[PDB]
Design a protein around this ligand. Structure first.
Ligand SMILES: [K+]
Ligand SMILES: [K+]
Ligand SMILES: [K+]
Ligand SMILES: [K+]
Ligand SMILES: [K+]
Ligand SMILES: [K+]
Ligand SMILES: [K+]
Ligand SMILES: [K+]
Ligand SMILES: [K+]
Ligand SMILES: [K+]
Ligand SMILES: [K+]
Ligand SMILES: [Mg+2]
Ligand SMILES: [Mg+2]
Ligand SMILES: [Mg+2]
Ligand SMILES: [Mg+2]
Ligand SMILES: [Mg+2]
Ligand SMILES: [Mg+2]
Ligand SMILES: [Mg+2]
Ligand SMILES: [Mg+2]
Ligand SMILES: [Mg+2]
Ligand SMILES: [Mg+2]
Ligand SMILES: [Mg+2]
Ligand SMILES: [Mg+2]
Ligand SMILES: [Mg+2]
Ligand SMILES: [Mg+2]
Ligand SMILES: [Mg+2]
Ligand SMILES: [Mg+2]
Ligand SMILES: [Mg+2]
Ligand SMILES: [Mg+2]
Ligand SMILES: [Mg+2]
Ligand SMILES: [Mg+2]
Ligand SMILES: [Mg+2]
Ligand SMILES: [Mg+2]
Ligand SMILES: [Mg+2]
Ligand SMILES: [Mg+2]
Ligand SMILES: [Mg+2]
Ligand SMILES: [Mg+2]
Ligand SMILES: [Mg+2]
Ligand SMILES: [Mg+2]
Ligand SMILES: [Mg+2]
Ligand SMILES: [Mg+2]
Ligand SMILES: [Mg+2]
Ligand SMILES: [Mg+2]
Ligand SMILES: [Mg+2]
Ligand SMILES: [Mg+2]
Ligand SMILES: [Mg+2]
Ligand SMILES: [Mg+2]
Ligand SMILES: [Mg+2]
Lengths: 65, 102, 61, 91
RNA sequence: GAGCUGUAAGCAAGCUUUGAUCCGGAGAUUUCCGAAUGGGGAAACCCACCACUCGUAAUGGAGUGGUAUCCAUAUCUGAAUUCAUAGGAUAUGAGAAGGCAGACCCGGGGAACUGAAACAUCUAAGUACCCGGAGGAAGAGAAAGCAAAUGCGAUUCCCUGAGUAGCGGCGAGCGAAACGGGAUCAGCCCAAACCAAGAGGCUUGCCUCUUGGGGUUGUAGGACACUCUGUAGGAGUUACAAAGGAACGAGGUAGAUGAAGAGGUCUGGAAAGGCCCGCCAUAGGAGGUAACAGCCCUGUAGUCAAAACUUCGUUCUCUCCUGAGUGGAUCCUGAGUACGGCGGAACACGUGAAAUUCCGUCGGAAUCCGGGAGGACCAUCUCCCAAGGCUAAAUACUCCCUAGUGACCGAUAGUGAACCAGUACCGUGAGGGAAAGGUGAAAAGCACCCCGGAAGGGGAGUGAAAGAGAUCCUGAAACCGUGUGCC
RNA sequence: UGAGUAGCGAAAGAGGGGUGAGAAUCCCCUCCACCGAAUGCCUAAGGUUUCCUGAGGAAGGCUCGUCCGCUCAGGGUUAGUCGGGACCUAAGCCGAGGCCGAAAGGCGUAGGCGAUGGACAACAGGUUGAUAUUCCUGUACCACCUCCUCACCAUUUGAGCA
RNA sequence: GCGAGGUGAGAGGUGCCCGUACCGCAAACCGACACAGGUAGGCGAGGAGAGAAUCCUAAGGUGAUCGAGAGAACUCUCGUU
């Protein structure tokens, strides 16, 4: 998900998707440990998606202050 | 680089001087290109799992980019490369004729 | 340290000289006397040079 | 903190496989995580009932690839015993 | 603008013209330690309290923020003690702290070896070193000066004066300055008299203090009076008061564009080389490319380019702002100061005939009919006005960044370090401190067969070359061998 | 060069069987021999993976090597009660203010830090190739907590806490 | 001092961090070495014995990281005369 799409969402909506992504990232790491994960590229994708959403949240806090 | 993947180029230097071919791949970091039919090498591959049998494989090896030139669309001769802005987009142009390479 | 609060007179270095003119290091101390005076508008026992007390502007408290 | 920050990954060994028959699950956890945080994290994520958490620290192992010597990361391993009347974790 | 997921091959899984990787501007995130600052601690660890938040029936657990010391300001309490004050508490602080560039600068403290053919004065040397303080420069600086002219006009630095004058167990040695020629140039603000207003001691029309005005000097100036005159032209944040904004121009931090030969032919693994012909050139810098390239590539000359941040300049805005004359009634013009004795230090100058400057100690002026200097001192003359402050430039230096240069090095050299080096190693520690570059144009890095457990080799293949096959360009000598012509 | 020389660092082995390209040297067996107030068992400091399993044999091992404290993989350390901290203090160390001192700093009060000491609740058995008062079985104990239960005492000479 | 709710018993519950492998009279620590050296503390059996002496043994541990011969001088450590 891109930063332009994330900015459409509300702060509560973004924070819910961060929680959803951190659930996905957890499951990927478990699948990696057991050796069941084919699409290893998804880990890097989810990590950067979390980073992108947390960046947007912090921009709003700085904009608020 | 002055050429890219997909371009028909003439090899202007080396053993394959005179031979035309399409750029199968480009290596900007090394300033090398892989031209089809040019600079064939005989690799001595051991039996792997990926390649099960092995054997002596004839394959292209990269040549230096400065040993190729793109063909002029009009004449079919080698040309140096200029750039013009057309429709906002930058395009390569053959310096010999004037026409767009890409 | 040994420093006058008013003037800032303190220990300074120089030479002893013998008759044969041999130099060896020594100090000159200020003639500091511990006295009660106003320091930031309140009595405090502090070093003041006898020279700084000479006029009597530095009032004893 | 997030529960899923606490638990890094499951330990899949012969020892850990033997522990799973006894209803004990071995996790690599955050090196800062205490055993109460681990207990809470497992109950939150997997929806199970923990009996107890035993926890241990592993030093980094000295390692070599050619000339260059170095250390592996230090690890915190938690052995999480579930209660008798509890759902099993699905690894 | 077409590839990309670094060294780093490799499989794997992906990303990318719906613009990735990559480059530059501005942001965000930024564990723990460290001044380290909640408290502790054997740095990178441990343990808290107070808010709020998550979680539990609750305890235990978790998250975020605050909580050092000193200093400044304010407020509230106010001991012995009456008022008070000390002390305590709380709040506000982009207040301090620490680091470094092994440089340059200014101070505090300050050696010795050494030289003197010994050595003590002296030298080395105010060096090294330690300490404090800085700043982009610092220090100095607007005459109590230089001098001895029908003078000069702040300081600093360069040349020169000059190895002179001088100093000196008159030994060893140390060693100016002014004039003259240059670089650069800039001058200012107070203190005091006095005036105005307010405050608290009434000392009771006096005095002290705090603001604003006034004022700034030497053949004296100012206050004070006079008459003038200005209150917005001139000045300005580099001193001369101090903040801010816009616009325009030129730079910096990415980039863009960019002329002309695969000319023919000859060797060759390959042509940039030879030979014979062209052509471009505001471009014949450079690097690369299979051998030596202005015309192959990246470029170069020239010409362009910036959303953003940033530097400089300019203009406006903005802000601030009277400065000339005449009079000598009085008043003011830097006090424990100048200066002197004693003891030291600094001056090129070693106590000397010893001016000049500074420190300790003690003594201690005059104050315009006054004071200082002109190398003891006095007189005369000349020049100047101390004991308050500020001040750019010319000057010094380079950890860095950008571009470039060298009758500088080329792997025992050049940095200690061309390479994963302040590493390995050594030492309890401070600290000491290495060795080690080259396959090939390209991995085309030797499929396959044979001996061998492997190592290693012989073929085969690749390559121009394998006696270029991995500390793989060349491959000297010592040294070690095999063969044998003569002895 | 010396030179195939000095040396190969106190010590009892022998044979049989095995493994392997290879065995005086590795494994197993038998008998023999050595230590036994230790050459045994536990545990500090210190070391820091040397531990266990599988594979390996260039180098290291004063020989050899199929073996190893060596090389390569993968694995292994479980605590309310043990030792240390969330307890206490000694020597000493640090030290708000403070005293002293050219600078740097020195000293020191309150207050802290600091075990080698004080205090302090868990035992027996079992188990793995590798941990065990830690895991498991049985049976305990200590501190704290209250959705609860029961009893008792008490709401200003009023229990109780301290 | 603090105080409207306490106290005792039961029942239910809570209990964090650090160390824990292995060597540790040793080839793993200090001695440059797989070095006849050094390395705190606990336990330390039997016979005969006063004993932790001494000799031989127990539990338990170990056979020592160059060997095979020969059995000259000489040197060393021993025994006898
Ligand atoms: K001397
Ligand atoms: K001499
Ligand atoms: K080329
Ligand atoms: K003098
Ligand atoms: K004096
Ligand atoms: K003068
Ligand atoms: K060197
Ligand atoms: K010969
Ligand atoms: K004995
Ligand atoms: K082995
Ligand atoms: K253990
Ligand atoms: Mg060109
Ligand atoms: Mg534990
Ligand atoms: Mg001498
Ligand atoms: Mg400055
Ligand atoms: Mg600065
Ligand atoms: Mg200055
Ligand atoms: Mg100013
Ligand atoms: Mg171009
Ligand atoms: Mg040609
Ligand atoms: Mg060549
Ligand atoms: Mg004056
Ligand atoms: Mg004279
Ligand atoms: Mg060389
Ligand atoms: Mg070198
Ligand atoms: Mg060391
Ligand atoms: Mg050769
Ligand atoms: Mg070459
Ligand atoms: Mg060679
Ligand atoms: Mg022999
Ligand atoms: Mg001999
Ligand atoms: Mg011999
Ligand atoms: Mg011998
Ligand atoms: Mg031996
Ligand atoms: Mg015996
Ligand atoms: Mg082992
Ligand atoms: Mg060997
Ligand atoms: Mg204890
Ligand atoms: Mg102290
Ligand atoms: Mg203090
Ligand atoms: Mg103790
Ligand atoms: Mg106990
Ligand atoms: Mg064990
Ligand atoms: Mg153990
Ligand atoms: Mg030993
Ligand atoms: Mg007996
Ligand atoms: Mg006995
Ligand atoms: Mg006899």
């Amino acid at each position: 998900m891109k930063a332009n799409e994330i900015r459409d969402l509300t702060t509560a909506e973004i924070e819910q998707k961060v929680k959803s992504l951190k659930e996905e990232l957890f499951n990927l790491r478990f699948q990696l440990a057991t050796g069941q994960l084919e699409n290893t590229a998804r880990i890097r994708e989810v990590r950067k998606a979390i980073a992108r959403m947390k960046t947007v949240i912090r921009e709003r806090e700085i904009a608020a202050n | 680089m002055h050429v890219k993947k997909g371009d028909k180029v003439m090899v202007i230097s080396g053993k394959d001087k005179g031979k035309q071919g399409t750029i199968l791949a480009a290596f900007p970091k090394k300033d090398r290109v892989l031209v089809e039919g040019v600079n064939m090498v005989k690799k001595h591959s051991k039996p792997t799992q990926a390649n099960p049998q092995g054997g002596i494989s004839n394959q292209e090896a990269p040549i230096h980019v400065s040993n190729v030139m793109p063909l002029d669309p009009k004449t079919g001769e080698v040309t140096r490369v200029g750039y013009k802005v057309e429709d906002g987009k930058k395009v390569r142009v053959a310096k010999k004729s004037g026409q767009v390479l890409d | 340290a040994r420093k006058c609060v008013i003037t800032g007179k303190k220990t300074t270095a120089g030479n002893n000289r013998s008759h044969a003119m041999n130099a060896s290091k020594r100090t000159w101390g200020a003639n500091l006397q511990k006295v009660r005076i106003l320091v930031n508008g309140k009595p405090k026992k502090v070093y003041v040079s006898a020279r700084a007390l000479k006029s009597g502007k530095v009032e004893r408290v | 903190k997030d529960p899923r920050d606490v638990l890094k990954r499951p330990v899949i060994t012969e020892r850990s496989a033997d522990l799973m028959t006894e209803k004990k699950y071995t996790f690599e956890v955050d090196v800062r995580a205490n055993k109460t945080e681990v207990k809470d994290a497992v109950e939150s994520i997997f929806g199970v009932k923990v009996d107890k958490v035993n926890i241990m620290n592993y030093k980094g192992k000295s390692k070599r690839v050619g000339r260059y010597t170095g250390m592996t990361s230090r690890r915190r391993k938690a052995i999480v015993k579930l209660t008798a009347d509890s759902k099993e974790i699905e690894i």
